[PDB]
Amino acid sequence: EYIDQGRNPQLYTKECLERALAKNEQVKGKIDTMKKFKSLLIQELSKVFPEDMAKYRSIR
Amino acid sequence: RKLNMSILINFLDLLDILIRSPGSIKREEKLEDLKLLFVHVHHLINEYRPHQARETLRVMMEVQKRQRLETAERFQKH
Amino acid sequence: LSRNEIIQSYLSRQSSLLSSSARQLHVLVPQSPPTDLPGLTREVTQDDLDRIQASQWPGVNGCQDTQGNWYDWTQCISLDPHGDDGRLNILPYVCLD
Amino acid sequence: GPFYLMRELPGSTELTGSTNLITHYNLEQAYNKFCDLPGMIDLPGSHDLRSLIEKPPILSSGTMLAGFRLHTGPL
Numbered sequence: 001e002y003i004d005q006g007r008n009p010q011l012y013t014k015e016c017l018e019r020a021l022a023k024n025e026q027v028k029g030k031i032d033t034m035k036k037f038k039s040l041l042i043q044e045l046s047k048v049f050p051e052d053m054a055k056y057r058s059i060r
Numbered sequence: 061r062k063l064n065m066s067i068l069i070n071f072l073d074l075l076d077i078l079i080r081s082p083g084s085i086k087r088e089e090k091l092e093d094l095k096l097l098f099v100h101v102h103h104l105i106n107e108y109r110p111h112q113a114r115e116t117l118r119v120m121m122e123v124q125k126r127q128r129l130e131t132a133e134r135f136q137k138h
Numbered sequence: 139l140s141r142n143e144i145i146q147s148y149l150s151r152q153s154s155l156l157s158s159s160a161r162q163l164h165v166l167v168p169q170s171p172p173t174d175l176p177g178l179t180r181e182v183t184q185d186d187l188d189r190i191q192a193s194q195w196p197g198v199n200g201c202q203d204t205q206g207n208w209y210d211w212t213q214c215i216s217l218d219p220h221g222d223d224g225r226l227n228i229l230p231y232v233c234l235d
Numbered sequence: 236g237p238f239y240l241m242r243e244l245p246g247s248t249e250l251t252g253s254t255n256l257i258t259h260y261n262l263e264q265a266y267n268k269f270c271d272l273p274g275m276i277d278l279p280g281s282h283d284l285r286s287l288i289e290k291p292p293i294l295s296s297g298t299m300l301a302g303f304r305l306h307t308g309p310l
Binding site for chain 2: 246247248249253
């Protein structure tokens with residue numbers, strides 16, 4: 001179909017590579033926000049529950 | 061208190077599942093696991109419900125007794 | 139489910155906080171090895187019933203507190219477990235009538 | 236002591252979506268190259284209806300006898 005449009009199929013290669021990097025960017029970003037949220041949660045729970053988060057950081 | 065802290069720590073371990081290996085088998089266990097914990101947190105406090113029931117009878121009786129004596133004293137003054 | 143937006147997320151915030159909510163907490167209560175029917179097994183006596191009627195018993199007849207104020211079961215307790223202006227309001231345990 | 240229903244977290248860094256999947260999958264140099272073949276083939280030929288019929292056949296998917304039966308005059 002891109003040959004029907006008269007372009008290079010190299011453009012289709014570029015677009016498949018770009019969509020691969022787009023999905024990898026989105027997934028790494030979601031995992032990074034989960035990392036920041038876990039860090040914030042353990043900070044605030046260590047503020048409010050000292051001994052329990054101490055034993056959790058011990059056990060890990 | 062143990063089940064509260066266990067619920068929070070299993071939520072943190074579910075976050076560790078979602079960080080490390082989302083395709084693991086354990087998350088299904090984990091999405092079952094804290095469910096069982098939540099069931100117990102309800103099942104313990106439902107066991108406060110007969111006790112609360114019995115206890116409200118007790119305080120009702122005390123209030124009942126007090127009101128009788130108050131009316132008695134009120135009437136005697138009159 | 140599909141989309142959460144600033145206004146709707148803030149609606150979730152105020153609804154959840156209005157459902158839920160210097161220390162001013164209750165005085166901690168330890169474990170209790172003497173319990174009356176199973177644990178200590180007191181033959182029905184009289185000091186325990188007089189304590190449950192007249193005196194202050196902090197596990198049975200009420201909830202005690204820091205700053206000293208006693209609250210029995212029919213009252214509502216105002217506390218502040220956080221360092222904020224938001225106050226926890228424990229409702230009464232019995233609610234007579 | 237231990238909390239209820241603690242268990243072992245998975246292996247520290249197995250395959251995730253947080254890695255660079257392309258560089259792990261050996262596809263980096265192709266991207267670094269990449270980031271018309273009608274024109275690149277018109278380097279060879281002249282230019283680049285019935286070609287729509289060519290693309291439609293693409294979307295759908297006795298030589299001596301022909302030279303002997305190809306009789307037609309010049310003018």
